[PDB]
Design a protein around this ligand. Structure first.
Ligand SMILES: *[C@H]1C(C#N)=C(O)[C@@H](C)[C@@H]2CCc3c(OC)nc(C)nc3[C@@]12C
Ligand SMILES: *[C@H]1C(C#N)=C(O)[C@@H](C)[C@@H]2CCc3c(OC)nc(C)nc3[C@@]12C
Lengths: 123, 123
């Protein structure tokens, strides 16, 4: 006989700690330098493996590093990184399209679908 | 108004990819060198942030690095790393105690409790 065990919300709890570590800027191996039209420059520290596990684009990119990012608004990038680390994303009704464009850019299909589904309803 | 969205099994899916990356030995930043009485030496590559998010002991340790580990059987370490990356652990009925001792050593309380609860029933 063999004993087997599964903790249901382990992944959720471990992501909570992973998110904590990102805010404390601990164990981070990538710094995203985001520049975009008009908007001020911004830096976001993260863990390559966490981003990679949420975005095929990020996974391709990585398989301390400073990465220059263009063509995406810093606040959009912020919301997508937050999604990677928390499984949740929120945005103002009037910017749903902008977030979708970032999501499409980094192939985060669930966010893409969600924004699309919402925008279809808005007409 | 603000749009908000949550993907339920995102963390589970992202851990699946994180587990994939570990097996492919990609993005890894720690190599655990495990030596124990009689048993042959073993190496385990992992991501510091993933272990850290499952074990307070690992979190303390980290906040490519080779780490020497003693006092724990390699197959026990293997099962705990697998738990960190999959939320699931299995062991032969006759070794539940050994896994518990590793779990206690690395303060993975859910595994500890599970093994304890099972061993209490076994008497
Ligand atoms: C619109 C908005 C609202 N309300 C948000 O929730 C964030 C996510 C948006 C960031 C991107 C953006 C851009 O990018 C070009 N332009 C405008 C006019 N507004 C937004 C935000 C602030
Ligand atoms: C016992 C066992 C079974 N059946 C397992 O499932 C694994 C996890 C054990 C690893 C540790 C261990 C030790 O460690 C000192 N000693 C013995 C005799 N057996 C085990 C395993 C193989």
């Amino acid at each position: 006989r063999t004993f087997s065990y599964t903790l249901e919300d382990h992944t959720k709890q471990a992501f909570g700690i992973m998110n904590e570590l990102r805010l404390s800027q601990q164990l981070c191996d990538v710094t995203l330098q985001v520049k975009y039209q008009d908007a001020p420059a911004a830096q976001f520290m993260a863990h390559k493996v966490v981003l990679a596990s949420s975005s095929p684009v990020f996974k391709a990119m990585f398989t301390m590093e400073v990465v220059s990012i263009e063509g995406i608004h810093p606040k959009v990038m912020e919301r997508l990184i937050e999604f990677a680390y928390t499984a949740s994303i929120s945005m103002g009704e009037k910017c749903v399209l902008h977030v979708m464009n970032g999501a499409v850019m980094y192939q985060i299909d669930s966010v893409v679908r969600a924004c699309s589904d919402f925008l279809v309803q808005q007409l």
